[PDB]
Amino acid sequence: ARVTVQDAVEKIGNRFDLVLVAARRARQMQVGGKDPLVPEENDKTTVIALREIEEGLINNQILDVRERQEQQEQEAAEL
Amino acid sequence: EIKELLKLGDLPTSGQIRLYDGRTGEQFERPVTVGYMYMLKLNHLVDDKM
Amino acid sequence: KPLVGTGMERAVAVDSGVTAVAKRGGVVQYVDASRIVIKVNEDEMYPGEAGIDIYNLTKYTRSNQNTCINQMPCVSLGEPVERGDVLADGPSTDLGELAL
Amino acid sequence: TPEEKLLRAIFGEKASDVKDSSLRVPNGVSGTVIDVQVFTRDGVEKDKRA
Amino acid sequence: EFLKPRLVDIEQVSSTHAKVTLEPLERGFGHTLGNALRRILLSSMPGCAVTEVEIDGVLHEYSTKEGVQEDILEILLNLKGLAVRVQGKDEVILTLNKSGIGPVTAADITHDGDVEIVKPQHVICHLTDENASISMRIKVQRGRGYVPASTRIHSEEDERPIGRLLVDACYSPVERIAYNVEAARVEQRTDLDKLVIEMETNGTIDPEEAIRRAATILAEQLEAFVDLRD
Amino acid sequence: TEFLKPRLVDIEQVTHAKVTLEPLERGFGHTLGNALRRILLSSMPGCAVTEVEIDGVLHEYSTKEGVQEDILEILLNLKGLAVRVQGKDEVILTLNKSGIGPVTAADITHDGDVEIVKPQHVICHLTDENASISMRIKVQRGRGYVPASTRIHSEEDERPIGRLLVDACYSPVERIAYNVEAARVEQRTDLDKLVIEMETNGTIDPEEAIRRAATILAEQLEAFVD
Amino acid sequence: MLNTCYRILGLKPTVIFADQIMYTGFAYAARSGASVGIDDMVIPEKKHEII
Amino acid sequence: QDVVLGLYYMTRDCVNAKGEGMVLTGPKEAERLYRSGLASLHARVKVRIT
Amino acid sequence: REEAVVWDILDEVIREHPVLLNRAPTLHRLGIQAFEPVLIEGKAIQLHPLV
Incomplete structure (x- = not known):
């Protein structure tokens, strides 16, 4: 569980896109996109989003490269 | 006139007794006041506000 | 009752109508949870065809704020009532006093 | 509706001629029913309870 | 090398x-057994009430x-403070019939062997009319603590009658328990205490x-510490 | 009439x-937290200098x-000595040390009746050129806590001047503090959850x-229960 | 005493230090028995001459 | 409001209370020394604190 | 019906779901603050004394 996002702003020093970055990654774990990277401890999908950002596993740059491959990775399915 | 009425009742004139705690059992230092205050109960009941 | 009053309570539970104040002195003759029957005295009795008096009470009813207002007897059989005495408490009265 | 109009034919749930609008106690309350009174327009029969 | 009180x-x-009194207490155990006993007796003694x-x-x-000459709302508030101790069974159903002018004291309940009124x-109530008649059927149970009518409704199980006036039940045979430790004296021991539990039941x-x-409620509970299971 | 035991x-x-521990009956949180807490702090057999x-x-x-330090500080170093003895009931160690540097406690003698745990x-920190520290420390079993202020006041073991006395803590505990907080049994909100937090030397x-400690407590209740 | 704990140790400890005060203040005031009476408020004895 | 009077009472100093002038060995002994009942909550003392 | 199952499903819906307490004459921005709820019994919204 998370009580303060003081740690998850040390990566993203803005506090106004820490919402945007983690409100978008927190959707991929709810609508059937992906699964959490860090191990879940019976928590919701917002707290697991704010717990990856602390570990550097997520930021506004990784989520683009992480998903921009999917078109190319689907390009094999794109023929 | 009050203090002369307490002394007739064997109560302590100052009006402060020593209360013992309820859970532990030790005694509150520096004694506490204990009296009989007529308490109303206004009709801002809770289960008409929520 | 108020354990520490100010003596100006009996004039607030009699001047209002909540109490069933006795209208002519005499002797209580039949108490009940919903009726009191005051056998009038001699000298305070009318000249011809007088008999006795009777006070009805008002059991559980509804005031304007939805609280209840019901009266209760406070006397028994044989009490010498007097003019201006009290027979029935009301909502928050006790023996005439005004306990809030 | 069209979809439910199949739902009726499947089970034969007779649609009622009359809609239910009885009086039910407000939520979050409980207490005996100490008194009931009935007022009737003069010209309509009094039921048994009336 | 300890002592144990007897x-x-x-x-x-009075009644x-x-x-x-608990005579031979080791030093330091006066306030430990007292407040651990005053806090049990006032809380969880089993009793019986309407x-x-x-x-x-x-x-x-x-x-x-x-x-x-009382509303029924006061006849229930007078029964709730009725003390009674049943020996054999677990619950009873008392009775009460009386007619004539005069106060109906509690002593006019029908006399059974096990049920033993105390006060x-x-x-x-009172009766104030020669052709008056009051006949009720009180109930009695065992338990502990306090269980109001509202929370005892959850286990109603289709209480069919509409004449079952429900009373709140506060089973507890203690009202105040003061205790004070003082200088006990065995024949030769420097410091021994004495506990004096001035109790007051109904x-x-x-x-x-x-x-x-009250002791077996403590001594039964300390097992979970004596065997720290992890 | 038939109570609730904790799982x-x-x-x-x-x-x-x-x-931790739960769910105790309501109001049984404190009557257990304070019975134990008054035993570990008050009476418990132990050994201390x-x-x-x-x-x-x-x-x-x-x-x-x-x-280096003065004897007001040295006794502070001895008051916290952690010693356990199996056989004896009064043993007087001997520490006569020399050298220069931090004089640890392992330089004490090693007798078959004692066994240090720290x-x-x-x-004491020793200066140079002295190497002259010797003392006879007296450890004796006991219960609880007894300051040195109320001993010399009733000084009955008459000792000439310079027989230094130290504050003795016999109990094997260093701190204990419980904390009660609500908890439920899935249908009742009047329950408890004890939380003990304990240290030792x-x-x-x-x-x-x-x-x-629950043993010493359930012994006092022996002549009452069935 | 809370301010210096913010400027130095940040916000992870100060939010958990601002509670250990509330649990300690509330506890040691209940053992204090800090009550007020009618003899606590001392009237000065020279009030007459001054008046 | 209430806590601030709790702490003020906890960190004052009387002039001659139970256990004055003795020397302690840290915060952990200073607490239990007061719980047991020997030393008063505000009595002048010498402790060692890191 | 308030069946005894919903009281354990409702507790998982309120795992980390911050609610917003706000008093009536909201003067400054500190008059609105979120909180993580904890289910009590009664009808009074408890509230930490520091806030």
Whole structure:
């Protein structure tokens, strides 16, 4: 569980896109996109989003490269 | 006139007794006041506000 | 009752109508949870065809704020009532006093 | 509706001629029913309870 | 190298008063057993008290029988403070029939063997009419603590009657328990304490029986520490 | 009439441990938390040093030559000594040390009646050229806590000047503090959850301490229960 | 005493230090028995001459 | 409001209370020394604190 | 019906779901603050004394 996002702003020093970055990654774990990277401890999908950002596993740059491959990775399915 | 009425009742004139705690059992230092205050109960009941 | 009053309570539970104040002195003759029957005295009795008096009470009813207002007897059989005495408490009265 | 109009034919749930609008106690309350009174327009029969 | 206290004389001052003393206490254990005993007796002693009344011709609490001189709302608030101790069974169903002018004291309940009323001068109501008649069927149960009518409704199980006036039940045979440790004196020991538990029941429960049922509530509970299971 | 005993008695290890326990009956949180807490702090058999014999000094507001700290500070180093003895009931150690540097506690003698549990517990830092520290420390079993102020007041073991006396803590505990907080049994909100948090000075592990304190407590209730 | 704990140790400890005060203040005031009476408020004796 | 009077009472100093002038050995002994009942909550003392 | 199952499903819906307490004459921006709820029994919204 998370009580303060003081740690998850040390990566993203803005506090106004820490919402945007983690409100978008927190959707991929709810609508059937992906699964959490860090191990879940019976928590919701917002707290697991704010717990990856602390570990550097997520930021506004990784989520683009992480998903921009999917078109190319689907390009094999794109023929 | 009050203090002369307490002394007739064997109560302590100052009006402060020593209360013992309820859970532990030790005694509150520096004694506490204990009296009989007529308490109303206004009709801002809770289960008409929520 | 108020354990520490100010003596100006009996004039607030009699001047209002909540109490069933006795209208002519005499002797209580039949108490009940919903009726009191005051056998009038001699000298305070009318000249011809007088008999006795009777006070009805008002059991559980509804005031304007939805609280209840019901009266209760406070006397028994044989009490010498007097003019201006009290027979029935009301909502928050006790023996005439005004306990809030 | 069209979809439910199949739902009726499947089970034969007779649609009622009359809609239910009885009086039910407000939520979050409980207490005996100490008194009931009935007022009737003069010209309509009094039921048994009336 | 410890000492263990033994039960000593039980001065019985009155029917509702009592004073029991625990003679040979080791130093430092006065306030430890006292407040661990005063906090148990006031909390969880099993008792018995009325559970639901039922009068002959009245439907709800806010009625007013004809002949008596109290609302039914006060006849229940007088029964709730009725002390009674049943020996054999677990629950009873008392009875009460009376007619004529005069206060209906509690001593006019029908006499059974097991059920043993304690306060027979208790007033219940009044009768003030020669052709008056009041006939109820009190109930009685065992338990502990306090369970109001509202929360005992959850286990109602289709209480079919509409004449079952429900009372709140506060089973507890203790009202106040003061205790004070003082300088006991064995023949030769520098410092030994004496506990004096000035108890006050409502005439129901035996004093020496209360402590032997307050200690086993403690000694039964410390097992979870003696065997720290992890 | 038939009470509730606790299951899910969790225990935590981090000589420091934070036990928990639940669900106790309502109001049984404190009557258990305070019965135990008044036993570990008040009466519990244990061993601890009581007096010291400085080999040359006869007063505390004096000063020992060559020793860094003063005897007001040294006794602070002895008051916390953790000693356990199996056989004896009064044993008087001997520490007569030389050298220069941090004089740890392992330089004490090693007798078959004692067994220290913190040998590197420092007692004094020695200066140069002295190497002259010797003392006769007296450990004796006991129960509870007894300051040195109320001993000399009733001084019955008459000792000439310079028989230094120290504050003796016999109990094997260093701190204990419970904390109650609500919890439920899935249908009742009037329950408890005890939380004990206990430390010790090495000579006894924590959970072992609570075990033999509920024992001393359930012994006093022997002549009452059935 | 809370301010210096913010400027130095940040916000992870100060939010958990601002609670250990509330649990300690509330506890040691209950053992204090800090009550007020009618003899606490001392009237000065020279009030007459001054008046 | 209430806590601030709790702490003010906890960190004052009387002039001659139970256990004055003795020397302690840290915060952990200073607490239990007061719980047991020997030393008063505000009595002048010498402790060692890191 | 308030069946005894919903009281354990409702507790998982309120795992980390911050609610917003706000008093009536909201003067400054500190008059609105979120909180993580904890289910009590009664009808009074408890509230930490520091806030």
